[PDB]
Each structure stands twice: as C-alpha cells, then as structure tokens.
Write a protein that binds this ligand. Structure first.
Ligand SMILES: Nc1ncnc2c1ncn2[C@@H]1O[C@H](COP(=O)(O)OP(=O)(O)CP(=O)(O)O)[C@@H](O)[C@H]1O
Ligand SMILES: O=C(O)C1=C[C@@H](O)[C@@H](O)[C@H](O)C1
Length: 168
C-alpha cells in the first residue's frame, strides 16, 4: 500500500513533488506512465498512436491496480488515470493527494517538448482548459487531500503535504 498516491493534471508537479515527497519519507517513487512503458516495452506515445487511448486506458487501469498493492512508497498516476471508473474505485481507501493547478501555470509548465498525446499544439491551452474542466470533478472524488501547487516552491509544497499527512 503506497504511503501516498499523487493525482493531478499533467504539469501539476506529480514528478517534481513525487520525488521530494518520496525522498523525504525514505521510500522509492513510482510512476504509472513509466511502469506501463516497461510492462509493454512500448512508449506511451506509441501505444496511443497505434492501439489507442481506449486500449491504453485499460493497460493503465491494470497497471495502477497492480501498483496499489505492490508499491510501498510514493505512487504517481498519469493525468487521465482518474477517468477510468475502475481506477477510481481502486483508490478508495488510499491516501490520495490531489495537486491542484490553474490553467495558467499548468500550461506554462508543459510548454516544453515532451511528447504529450492529449496536449499537443496548436491551441495547446484550450486543450488544457478542457482537460482541467472535464477532470477537475474526478480528482476531487478520489482525493482525500487537496493541495495547491500553483503559487508555491516545489519544496514548500512537500513541506505542506507531510504536515497534513501526520496530523488529523
Ligand atoms: N510546486 C511547484 N511550484 C513551482 N513550479 C513547479 C511545481 N511543481 C512542479 N513545477 C514545475 O512544473 C514543470 C512540470 O512539472 P512536472 O514535471 O512535475 O509535471 P507532471 O509530472 O505533472 C506531468 P506528466 O504527468 O506529464 O508526467 C517543471 O518545470 C517543474 O519545475
Ligand atoms: O492527460 C493525460 O490523460 C495523459 C497524461 C500523460 O501522463 C500520459 O499518460 C499521456 O500523455 C496521457
């Protein structure tokens, strides 16, 4: 059982924070997007382009359920992880930290050049607003703790988290 599951829109910090939240607790971090690229031997960019999100979402669903019982440290979920009705029920009972972010910073932190299937230019922001709107509800449903990583220092966020994870 993960010491904490991290969910949030791509660009919310899931990785930056998943590392500091894991290194501070003394437990390895784990990414579902990365776990899938291993169990399949295929890049998520391909699995999407060739087989499709439909099938991908299934594979992710199976991989997540797999980590919710195997991993003992910090677990990080892919953006649309919470769109899978099955994934949301596997999260029931876990410590789920929803890292919130506004369309402003979210898009500013994702304008790099990593191949994001669901977030590709042009109008890469309209796409972000949509993802945010459509999913925001979902993240609330599975989140046992809502932390804002918007205006904050990657470390000051982990600071905030650990306190609320030790206090009732
Ligand atoms: N709490 C925070 N405050 C300030 N900037 C932060 C932040 N957390 C992360 N960032 C910045 O946001 C950028 C993207 O962060 P991150 O890589 O964690 O996205 P992500 O893991 O949510 C996306 P994906 O789901 O695609 O893997 C980095 O440049 C990072 O420095
Ligand atoms: O927003 C999403 O649903 C995604 C986020 C990434 O982590 C990858 O899992 C993939 O690009 C899909």
């Amino acid at each position: 059982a993960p010491k904490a599951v991290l969910v949030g829109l791509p660009g919310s910090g899931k990785s930056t924070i998943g590392r500091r939240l894991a290194k501070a607790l003394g437990v390895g971090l784990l990414d579902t997007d990365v776990a899938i690229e291993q169990r399949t031997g295929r890049s998520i960019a391909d699995i999407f382009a060739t087989d499709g999100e439909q099938e991908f979402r299934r594979i992710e669903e199976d991989v997540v359920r797999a980590a919710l019982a195997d991993h003992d440290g910090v677990l990080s979920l892919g953006g649309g992880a919470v769109t899978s009705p099955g994934v949301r029920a596997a999260l029931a009972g876990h410590t789920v930290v929803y890292l919130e972010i506004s369309a402003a910073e979210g898009v500013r932190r994702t304008g790099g050049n990593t191949v994001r299937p669901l977030l590709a230019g042009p109008d890469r922001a309209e796409k972000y607003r949509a993802l945010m709107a459509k999913r925001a509800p979902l993240y609330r449903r599975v989140a046992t703790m809502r932390v804002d990583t918007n205006r904050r220092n990657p470390g000051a966020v982990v600071r905030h988290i650990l306190s609320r994870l030790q206090v009732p």
